[PDB]
């Protein structure tokens, strides 16, 4: 249940909840076989050299050709019942859909996670923002995705990303300088952001099917960036779908997350993480 899964958080997407169902396939495979091998090494501690079989060397047997064939196929069929479930689950992931229902650029620059919003089309067909200006992009003579509802997140603001909690979400994963990493640990999933993903034969993007919980969760950076790699914390918020429509309408007129999250009566700063004292000074 909770102890057999060695510390995984309960997934909030239905694709992450499939990992935690597969992670307790440690029981069927690892801790089962890992107790058989302990059950033979600690079984040969009742086989000491006692003072009766002292002038008699043992049977001196070296080749048992039925045993290296039975105990080869049995480790082979366990990794043949794997490479089935770990192909089905990664095919449940890596999945795309031409109605993504919100598209969020993440644009991991050097050390503080500049987010941003692109086109969004709910299943009701009611919101339909669709904002990503190409005229700002033509000021750079690139691969980055610029837009107008971006969340900057300076060194003391600790960027809070807001996304609804019943809809499909797409994360276009870009980076300005170095390969960083994008890891909300509650999304039991992680993809490294690259400088130029379409030039590196990368896939650049992933999608979650929905979110099944409300609240607000931590996000960290994983692949190493440099000095302040431990300071790149972002913090998603899974607001209601009705509070998300009131988030952008306060934000489209132009405010900040200290003011846009206040109009939907939610704590404006990050509540599961906070800026570091070792970096601000």
């Amino acid at each position: 249940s909770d102890a057999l899964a060695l510390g995984w958080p309960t997934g909030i997407t239905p694709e992450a909840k499939l990992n935690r169902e597969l992670w307790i396939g440690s029981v069927i495979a690892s801790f089962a076989v890992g107790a058989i091998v302990w059950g033979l090494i600690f079984w040969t501690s009742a086989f000491h050299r006692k003072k009766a079989t002292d002038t008699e060397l043992p049977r001196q047997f070296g080749y048992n050709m039925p045993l290296e064939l039975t105990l080869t196929v049995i480790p082979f069929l366990i990794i043949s019942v794997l490479f089935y479930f770990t192909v089905v689950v990664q095919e449940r992931m890596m999945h795309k859909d031409p109605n993504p229902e919100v598209v969020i650029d993440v644009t991991a620059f050097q050390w503080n996670w500049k987010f941003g919003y692109q086109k969004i089309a709910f299943a009701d067909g009611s919101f339909d923002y669709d904002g990503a200006d190409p005229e700002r992009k033509e000021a750079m003579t690139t691969y980055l995705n610029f837009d107008k509802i971006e969340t900057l997140g300076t060194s003391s603001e600790i960027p809070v990303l807001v996304l609804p909690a019943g809809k499909r979400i797409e994360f276009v994963l870009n980076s300005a300088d170095v390969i960083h990493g994008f890891w909300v640990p509650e999304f039991l999933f992680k993809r490294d952001v690259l400088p130029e993903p379409k030039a590196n034969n990368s896939d650049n993007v992933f999608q979650v099917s929905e979110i099944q919980q409300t609240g607000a969760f931590v996000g960290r950076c994983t692949e190493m960036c440099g000095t302040f790699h431990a300071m790149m914390n972002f913090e998603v918020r899974v607001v209601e779908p009705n509070d998300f429509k009131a988030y952008i309408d306060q934000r489209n007129a132009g405010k900040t997350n200290a003011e846009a999250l206040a109009a939907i009566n939610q704590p404006p700063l990050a509540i599961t993480t906070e800026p570091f004292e070792s970096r601000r000074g």
Partner: protein, 162 residues
């Protein structure tokens, strides 16, 4: 304030040759101002056909095209209209793409250092960032708030002085 009579006569003496509100050297860049302001029009464009006339540091010299009262007056005449932590993060997010390691995206030899910026000061940097030079697009209003512009200007200034 800046004397607009001095500003008109300075425009006629030194800028009418390439600019009649137009530009004869790069046609579209004459009535085209991005994030136009008195501070930006005052700041010497670091790239393009003509470099800023001001002598290095704003010191008196024998080849200055102008003195300070003349600059302010002309910048005003053209302008008729009729936290270092934040600074470092803003630099990395918006300017590192072309100015990584204090360098220049257009030319490797060209740099953001004071020798490259001559008579640089915080105000001159802030102004080019606001509306910007020919090489980099304007940042004020469009991309960065005043605190962010102020912080990034300070960070660039401290990095170049040290």
């Amino acid at each position: 304030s800046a004397l607009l009579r001095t500003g008109k006569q300075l425009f006629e003496t030194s800028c009418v040759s390439c600019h009649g509100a137009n530009l004869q050297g790069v046609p579209d860049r004459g009535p085209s101002l991005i994030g136009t302001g008195e501070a930006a029009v005052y700041f010497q464009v670091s790239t393009g056909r003509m470099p800023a006339m001001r002598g290095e540091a704003q010191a008196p010299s024998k080849p200055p095209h102008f003195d300070e009262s003349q600059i302010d007056a002309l910048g005003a005449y053209v302008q008729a209209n009729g936290d270092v932590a934040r600074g470092g993060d803003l630099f990395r997010l918006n300017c590192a793409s072309c100015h990584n390691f204090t360098g220049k995206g257009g030319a490797l030899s060209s740099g953001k250092y004071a020798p490259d910026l001559g008579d640089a000061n915080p105000a001159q940097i802030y102004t080019a960032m606001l509306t910007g030079p020919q090489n980099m697009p304007k940042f004020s209003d469009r991309q960065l708030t005043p605190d962010e512009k102020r912080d990034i200007v300070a960070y660039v200034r401290e990095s170049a002085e040290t």
